[PDB]
Write a protein that binds this ligand. Structure first.
Ligand SMILES: CCCCCCCCCCCCCCC(=O)OC[C@H](COP(=O)(O)OCC[N+](C)(C)C)OC(=O)CCCCCCCCC
Ligand SMILES: CCCCCCCCCCCCCCC(=O)OC[C@H](COP(=O)(O)OCC[N+](C)(C)C)OC(=O)CCCCCCCCC
Ligand SMILES: [Fe+3]
Ligand SMILES: [Fe+3]
Lengths: 309, 309
């Protein structure tokens, strides 16, 4: 069956998209018209049957019903694709991104408590939590330590769950989520625990689709960062714990060279005492370098729906 | 800045689609690879920003959270387009569809009370209800009256609400939904009320998107039909109440010539008695002709998720 190219289908697409209507948002009509045309044509080229089509429609209800559209998005590469475009755009502007950007993920929560230079991020409720001392320096576009920079950090516990999105009931609010203002030396330091990789809800629609593609829904253990400072663009990035089995096989394709960091284990009394910890702990050091605004504006900040508490 | 047609993106699309993955369903992979490709390209061609992109993802979650994907589908023309494809395929097979097919819509419910030849489908709870006597003859593929055919009929009340999907929660199960087995004369007859036009939930995601297209979300008053019989293909169609303002401006583009039916108003006592009614009523007559199976196979039945109670 080949009717996509006929006038009847072509005119129909314009009507359905409201291209004839006077009211509405032209930008939305422009996008809808293109997306519907491509889908109508894809249904024809791939000879998608009504049975297949309705299975897709049902999937869609299920995806939104479980609020996983933002989990499927990175899984299908969109999130990373958008970063590639941003990288291509910076490269064209001659902007050299000292610290590579990567995806934000759908689990950011605004409102975390903030403090200067230091904070403990966890409430010690994770029975199997291994102490992690994470610290580093923030450099401005000139390569100079930058005090007063806001470093936002969030990560999962040893079960791969984030506060506010923990499927097993509650975690204290903002557990493992803190905002840290860099100190006089442009440094930040946090005490938290080593996160475990995140895994998509096994029975959720995202995992269901990934199974049909022969793919897993796992992420290596990682820690999220937002770094913002006057005169600089907002940096969105992450660090992956070196050695993780999924370091180079992340279902969200967010891992990058330069973002893989080693977690050094300390067990000697001198180190333990010096960082005033109660026992053996891991240490990770990670510095971030920011880029300047482009003609006074941040050409890459993303405004997207984020939970606020 | 264009990167879609570069090796890095093309290779990425195959990876995200699971193409070089051993497990999975190849049919799903093939469709996902085509859809992702088109969407990655549309994002580049229309220069869709991350901000615009995340607004689309958010919409997707609400679409599903409100179980409206099956409502938006017809509004974007997919349902009708699939019917166009079916008609095209029937024409190619030399099949003449005496009674044209049209969309099923997303509100069919399986399990309705069944009776022979006659049935009253409303329970009288509807205050503004206007008695309607809808009757007709079902013809087999040779034009002969066909007894024991199963006629399924469902429609909205005077408020434009369907039982099982009535926000007011007024209606009892299967109100205005019945299956009628045609009698010895191949006839079906029902007493019900004139339905009112259906309108998408004004606050719902379907209507919100339709507003952005400068479009309304109304359907003319109509009555749905499923007619099935041994040796014949299952017919999916509907009739429109002639005169309705939205007859030729249905948001689901389901109207077709041959399906617009006049509701004859009867007011003399002679007709009221001959029909066993309490007063003035409307009458609609609609006969349906079925098509024979194609080598013992119904090549157009659609198996899609349908509510069963
Ligand atoms: C409102 C407009 C929206 C339009 C949507 C775009 C068009 C839709 C494309 C259709 C893709 C259909 C392919 C799915 C399919 O034909 O079968 C998919 C599988 C089912 O597996 P089976 O084992 O065969 O099930 C049966 C097992 N039994 C036999 C034992 C019973 O189930 C699934 O959920 C996979 C479905 C994923 C498709 C979602 C794509 C969306 C990406 C953005
Ligand atoms: C698995 C994930 C797959 C994802 C597929 C992604 C889709 C592709 C990109 C879609 C881009 C949509 C662009 C929409 C947009 O740029 O803005 C959309 C509006 C917003 O209204 P505004 O008044 O502009 O908001 C602003 C008010 N201010 C100005 C005062 C701030 O609202 C909406 O509902 C938009 C609804 C979009 C419909 C998407 C349909 C695709 C389904 C077939
Ligand atoms: Fe994460
Ligand atoms: Fe309907």
């Amino acid at each position: 069956v080949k009717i996509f190219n006929t006038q009847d289908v072509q005119d129909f697409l314009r009507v359905a998209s409201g291209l004839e209507q006077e009211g509405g948002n032209p930008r939305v009509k422009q996008i809808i018209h293109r997306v519907l045309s491509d889908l109508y044509k894809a249904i024809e080229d791939l000879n998608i049957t009504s049975d297949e089509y309705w299975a897709g429609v049902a999937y869609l209800n299920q995806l939104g019903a479980n609020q996983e559209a933002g989990l499927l998005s990175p899984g299908l590469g969109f999130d990373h694709y958008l970063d590639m475009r941003m990288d291509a755009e910076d490269a064209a502007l001659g902007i050299e991104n000292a610290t590579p950007r990567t995806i934000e993920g759908p689990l950011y929560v605004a409102g975390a408590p903030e403090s200067v230079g230091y904070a403990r991020m966890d409430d010690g409720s994770d029975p199997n939590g291994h102490t992690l001392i994470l610290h580093g320096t923030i450099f401005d576009a000139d390569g100079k330590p930058l005090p007063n920079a806001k470093v936002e950090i969030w990560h999962a516990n040893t079960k791969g769950f984030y506060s506010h999105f923990d499927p097993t009931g509650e975690q204290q609010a903002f557990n493992m989520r803190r905002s840290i203002i860099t100190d006089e030396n442009g440094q930040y330091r946090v005490r938290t625990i080593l996160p475990a990789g995140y895994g998509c809800p096994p029975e959720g629609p995202t995992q269901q689709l990934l199974n049909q593609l022969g793919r897993h829904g796992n992420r290596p253990a990682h820690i999220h960062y937002f770094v913002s400072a006057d005169g600089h663009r907002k940096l969105t990035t992450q660090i992956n714990v070196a050695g993780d089995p999924y370091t180079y096989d992340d279902f969200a394709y967010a891992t990058r060279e330069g973002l893989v960091v080693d977690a050094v284990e300390h067990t000697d009394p001198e180190a333990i005492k010096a960082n005033d910890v109660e026992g053996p702990f891991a240490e990770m050091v990670f510095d971030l370098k920011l880029t300047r605004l482009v003609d006074g504006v941040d050409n890459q900040v993303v405004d997207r729906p984020r939970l606020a508490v």
